[PDB]
Scaffold this active site. Structure first.
Site, PDB file in Angstrom:
ATOM      1  N   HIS A  60      -9.624   0.549   4.530  1.00 43.59           N
ATOM      2  CA  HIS A  60      -8.520   1.030   5.345  1.00 43.59           C
ATOM      3  C   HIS A  60      -8.897   2.106   6.352  1.00 43.59           C
ATOM      4  O   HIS A  60      -9.680   2.946   6.187  1.00 43.59           O
ATOM      5  CB  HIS A  60      -7.384   1.433   4.359  1.00 43.59           C
ATOM      6  CG  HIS A  60      -6.155   1.684   4.982  1.00 43.59           C
ATOM      7  ND1 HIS A  60      -5.626   2.813   5.825  1.00 43.59           N
ATOM      8  CD2 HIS A  60      -5.169   0.845   4.624  1.00 43.59           C
ATOM      9  CE1 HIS A  60      -4.476   2.390   6.105  1.00 43.59           C
ATOM     10  NE2 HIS A  60      -3.976   1.181   5.539  1.00 43.59           N
ATOM     11  N   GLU A 116      -5.626  -4.293  11.066  1.00 43.93           N
ATOM     12  CA  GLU A 116      -4.636  -3.079  11.363  1.00 43.93           C
ATOM     13  C   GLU A 116      -4.856  -3.088  12.689  1.00 43.93           C
ATOM     14  O   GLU A 116      -5.840  -2.480  13.138  1.00 43.93           O
ATOM     15  CB  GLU A 116      -5.033  -1.824  10.617  1.00 43.93           C
ATOM     16  CG  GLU A 116      -5.380  -1.895   9.109  1.00 43.93           C
ATOM     17  CD  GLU A 116      -5.529  -0.926   8.325  1.00 43.93           C
ATOM     18  OE1 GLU A 116      -4.674   0.142   8.250  1.00 43.93           O
ATOM     19  OE2 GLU A 116      -6.587  -0.835   7.907  1.00 43.93           O
ATOM     20  N   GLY A 172       1.401   4.759  16.037  1.00 37.93           N
ATOM     21  CA  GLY A 172       1.634   6.226  16.421  1.00 37.93           C
ATOM     22  C   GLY A 172       1.140   6.451  17.632  1.00 37.93           C
ATOM     23  O   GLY A 172       1.188   7.721  17.864  1.00 37.93           O
ATOM     24  N   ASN A 208       0.762  -1.193   0.086  1.00 34.74           N
ATOM     25  CA  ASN A 208      -0.013  -0.174   0.072  1.00 34.74           C
ATOM     26  C   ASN A 208       1.007   1.114  -0.193  1.00 34.74           C
ATOM     27  O   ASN A 208       1.464   1.670   1.005  1.00 34.74           O
ATOM     28  CB  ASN A 208      -0.825  -0.115   1.294  1.00 34.74           C
ATOM     29  CG  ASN A 208      -1.666   1.149   1.293  1.00 34.74           C
ATOM     30  OD1 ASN A 208      -1.816   1.934   0.438  1.00 34.74           O
ATOM     31  ND2 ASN A 208      -2.520   1.414   2.443  1.00 34.74           N
ATOM     32  N   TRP A 209       1.201   1.880  -1.112  1.00 33.46           N
ATOM     33  CA  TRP A 209       1.965   3.098  -1.352  1.00 33.46           C
ATOM     34  C   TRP A 209       1.407   4.144  -0.487  1.00 33.46           C
ATOM     35  O   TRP A 209       1.947   5.271  -0.212  1.00 33.46           O
ATOM     36  CB  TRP A 209       2.030   3.376  -2.787  1.00 33.46           C
ATOM     37  CG  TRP A 209       2.570   2.384  -3.519  1.00 33.46           C
ATOM     38  CD1 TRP A 209       3.036   1.168  -3.486  1.00 33.46           C
ATOM     39  CD2 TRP A 209       3.193   2.671  -4.982  1.00 33.46           C
ATOM     40  NE1 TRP A 209       3.587   0.554  -4.401  1.00 33.46           N
ATOM     41  CE2 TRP A 209       3.614   1.399  -5.332  1.00 33.46           C
ATOM     42  CE3 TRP A 209       3.147   3.661  -5.794  1.00 33.46           C
ATOM     43  CZ2 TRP A 209       4.240   1.457  -6.694  1.00 33.46           C
ATOM     44  CZ3 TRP A 209       3.907   3.611  -7.076  1.00 33.46           C
ATOM     45  CH2 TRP A 209       4.146   2.565  -7.644  1.00 33.46           C
ATOM     46  N   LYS A 210       0.011   4.241  -0.044  1.00 37.17           N
ATOM     47  CA  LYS A 210      -0.756   5.288   0.127  1.00 37.17           C
ATOM     48  C   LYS A 210      -0.616   6.498  -0.692  1.00 37.17           C
ATOM     49  O   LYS A 210      -0.386   6.245  -1.977  1.00 37.17           O
ATOM     50  CB  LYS A 210      -0.473   5.430   1.663  1.00 37.17           C
ATOM     51  CG  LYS A 210      -0.427   4.395   2.390  1.00 37.17           C
ATOM     52  CD  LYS A 210      -0.263   4.810   4.013  1.00 37.17           C
ATOM     53  CE  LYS A 210      -0.591   3.432   4.836  1.00 37.17           C
ATOM     54  NZ  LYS A 210      -0.403   3.808   6.428  1.00 37.17           N
ATOM     55  N   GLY A 255       3.045  -0.890   4.469  1.00 42.18           N
ATOM     56  CA  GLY A 255       2.804   0.448   4.456  1.00 42.18           C
ATOM     57  C   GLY A 255       4.170   1.200   3.862  1.00 42.18           C
ATOM     58  O   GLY A 255       4.701   0.807   2.577  1.00 42.18           O
ATOM     59  N   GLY A 256       5.184   1.955   4.534  1.00 37.11           N
ATOM     60  CA  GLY A 256       6.314   2.604   4.041  1.00 37.11           C
ATOM     61  C   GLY A 256       7.130   1.794   3.492  1.00 37.11           C
ATOM     62  O   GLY A 256       7.885   2.223   2.560  1.00 37.11           O
ATOM     63  N   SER A 267       2.541  -2.152  11.926  1.00 39.19           N
ATOM     64  CA  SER A 267       4.029  -2.118  11.528  1.00 39.19           C
ATOM     65  C   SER A 267       4.669  -3.299  11.056  1.00 39.19           C
ATOM     66  O   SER A 267       4.963  -4.107  11.860  1.00 39.19           O
ATOM     67  CB  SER A 267       4.813  -1.518  12.660  1.00 39.19           C
ATOM     68  OG  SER A 267       4.027  -0.343  13.079  1.00 39.19           O
ATOM     69  N   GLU A 271      -7.241   4.505   7.417  1.00 36.85           N
ATOM     70  CA  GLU A 271      -7.238   5.951   7.179  1.00 36.85           C
ATOM     71  C   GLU A 271      -8.499   6.313   6.315  1.00 36.85           C
ATOM     72  O   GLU A 271      -8.780   7.720   6.286  1.00 36.85           O
ATOM     73  CB  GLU A 271      -6.041   6.153   6.168  1.00 36.85           C
ATOM     74  CG  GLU A 271      -4.793   5.687   7.131  1.00 36.85           C
ATOM     75  CD  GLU A 271      -3.575   5.624   6.056  1.00 36.85           C
ATOM     76  OE1 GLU A 271      -3.465   5.838   5.035  1.00 36.85           O
ATOM     77  OE2 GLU A 271      -2.541   5.141   6.684  1.00 36.85           O
TER      78      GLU A 271
END
Lengths: 253, 253
Positions: free
Chosen positions: A98, A170, A176, A9-11, A237-238, A216, A100
């Site tokens: 998702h 998730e 965070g 998932n590049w977001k 994710g990242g 993560s 987000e």
């Protein structure tokens, strides 16, 4: 027999030039290393699907997804992308629900079912995302809350439509917040999901669904997370944005 | 030096193949008829931007847009598309604040400002949409409601940033309600808009802004609507999807 899946998932990241560089590196490494028993999915922003599809070409085990789709088939919905559009551009997966999007766009369970219907109607494998935020954990109702998410969005599906879906958990509470989720806690939630799905569709059907960890997940912890029996991969994710890190995760089963 | 603009908003319509053949028809007729004094913008869904930009080629006066963009620069906003992404894929316009997004996704004036900031920051010409619903007309507050939209989202802009904007007026009260907006009613609202933009930026600057009609606009009424002094073109709906209708509107100034 479930499939192991790594879904990137590049977001909302990467312009045209950057997406091409990333994709070309992933495709080259996947074509050369010929990873046998892992399905890889690139989920770039909408604008990238066409050129990313081209770079993938006929690479085996490498698939194009997407980060969202409309609950409507077509029409007066300026700014929205339909499932039929995604399929037409080479998508075979679609992330639905998702955290987000639930958060910033208030996608509720009814809306996510409509999206699921569009995905299934148009030959897309939905990656249905569930997960509880920190308040839910602090209330101790995390297992009921996530099973509740699954019940409201998925338990309307036929036996044949259920077998077409992939789940991503998730741990929103562990992203965070200063709280961390262990691989045991991920296994605990994943098993709670599979047992819940088996309660409706039977154990054999639940035993074929891929449940991906969406917390993560990086080259450091991927092997330990994927080692868990009810974790069937990850929604990355990242690390999706780094071809090397992404390949390291893919090679962590 | 107001430009006459014909901007085609496909909304959530057309797959890959349909968007290409529609585009190849628009491009062929613009090239062959040598359209010279009209800015033509295609705002297809996100997924089409990359192949549509190729077809547009170096066609004069034919530009690529988009139907929405994020208020954020980049990052963890799954499903969202940024202005830098759009610029990267050939977009030089972007629709912001369309009535269908204000309704279905509750986009408020505080959010649209962010989108505006991102658009200008990345070299995009924002097509800022505004309009009033039928309940506002019946309330007797149509002009002030639309002006408040403009005040809330646009008056934070510098003089140099304001000069780069395009306005679209959507008579939401006259779209699918049974009510009709005459070309004089459209002129009246377009004139009210210009004078309101001149309140902050002066008449000279306001006299430079293209204000496009966003109501029912098609070959049957384009010439009469466009002939109005404060109407500088149209933000076209369904006629965007028919190459002949779209070209007839382009030729209606």
């Amino acid at each position: 027999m479930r499939k192991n899946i790594v879904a990137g998932n590049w977001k909302m990241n990467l312009n045209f030039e950057e997406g091409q560089k990333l994709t070309s590196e992933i495709v080259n490494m996947i074509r050369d290393e010929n990873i046998k028993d892992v399905s890889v999915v690139l989920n770039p922003p909408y604008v990238h699907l066409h050129p990313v599809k081209k770079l993938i070409g006929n690479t085996a085990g490498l698939f194009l997804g997407a980060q969202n789709c409309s609950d409507k088939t077509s029409g007066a919905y300026t700014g929205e992308i339909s499932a039929s559009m995604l399929a037409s551009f080479g998508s075979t997966f679609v992330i639905i629900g998702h955290s987000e999007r639930r958060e910033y766009f208030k996608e509720d369970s009814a809306l996510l079912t409509g999206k699921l219907t569009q995905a299934l109607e148009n030959g897309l494998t939905p990656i249905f995302c569930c997960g509880e935020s920190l308040d839910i954990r602090e209330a101790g109702t995390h297992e009921e809350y996530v099973k509740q998410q699954l019940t409201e969005s998925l338990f309307g599906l036929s036996a044949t439509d259920f077998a077409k879906i992939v789940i991503a958990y998730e741990p929103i509470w562990a992203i965070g917040t200063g709280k961390t989720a262990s691989s045991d806690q991920a296994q605990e939630m994943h098993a709670a999901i599979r047992t819940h799905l088996a309660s409706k569709y039977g154990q054999a059907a639940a035993d074929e669904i891929s449940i991906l960890y969406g917390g993560s997940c990086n080259p450091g912890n991927a092997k330990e997370i994927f080692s868990k029996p009810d974790v069937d991969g990850g929604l990355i994710g990242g690390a999706s944005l780094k071809s090397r890190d992404f390949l390291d995760i893919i090679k962590s089963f």
